[PDB]
Amino acid sequence: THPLESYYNQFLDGLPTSELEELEIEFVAMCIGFPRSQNNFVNALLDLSTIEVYTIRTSVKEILRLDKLNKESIENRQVTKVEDITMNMNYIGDIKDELVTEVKKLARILKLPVLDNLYVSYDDVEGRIGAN
Amino acid sequence: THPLESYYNQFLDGLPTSELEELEIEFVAMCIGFPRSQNNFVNALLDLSTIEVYTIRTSVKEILRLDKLNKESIENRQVTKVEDITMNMNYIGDIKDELVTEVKKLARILKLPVLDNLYVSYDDVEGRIGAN
Amino acid sequence: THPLESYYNQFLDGLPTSELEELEIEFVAMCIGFPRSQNNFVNALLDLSTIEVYTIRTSVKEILRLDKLNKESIENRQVTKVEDITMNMNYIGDIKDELVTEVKKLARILKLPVLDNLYVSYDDVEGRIGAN
Amino acid sequence: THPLESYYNQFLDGLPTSELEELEIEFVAMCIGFPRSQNNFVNALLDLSTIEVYTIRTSVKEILRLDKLNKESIENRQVTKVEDITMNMNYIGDIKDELVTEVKKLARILKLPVLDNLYVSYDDVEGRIGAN
Amino acid sequence: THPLESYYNQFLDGLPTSELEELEIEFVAMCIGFPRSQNNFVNALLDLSTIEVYTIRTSVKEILRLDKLNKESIENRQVTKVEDITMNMNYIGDIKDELVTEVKKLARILKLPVLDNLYVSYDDVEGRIGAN
Amino acid sequence: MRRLKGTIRHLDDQPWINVSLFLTLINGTFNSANQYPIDTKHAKTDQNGEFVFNVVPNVGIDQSYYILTTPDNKKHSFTVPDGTSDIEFSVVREAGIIATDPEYTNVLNYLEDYIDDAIANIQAS
Amino acid sequence: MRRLKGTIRHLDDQPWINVSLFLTLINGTFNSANQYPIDTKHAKTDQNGEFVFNVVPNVGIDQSYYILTTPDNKKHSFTVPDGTSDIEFSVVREAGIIATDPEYTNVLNYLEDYIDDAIANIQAS
Amino acid sequence: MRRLKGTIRHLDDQPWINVSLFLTLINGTFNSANQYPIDTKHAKTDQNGEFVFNVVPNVGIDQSYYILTTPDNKKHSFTVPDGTSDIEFSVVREAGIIATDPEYTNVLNYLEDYIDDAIANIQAS
Question: Where would you tag: which of B14, D42, D85, G50 has the fewest CB atoms within 10 A of its CB?
Answer without folding.
Answer: B14
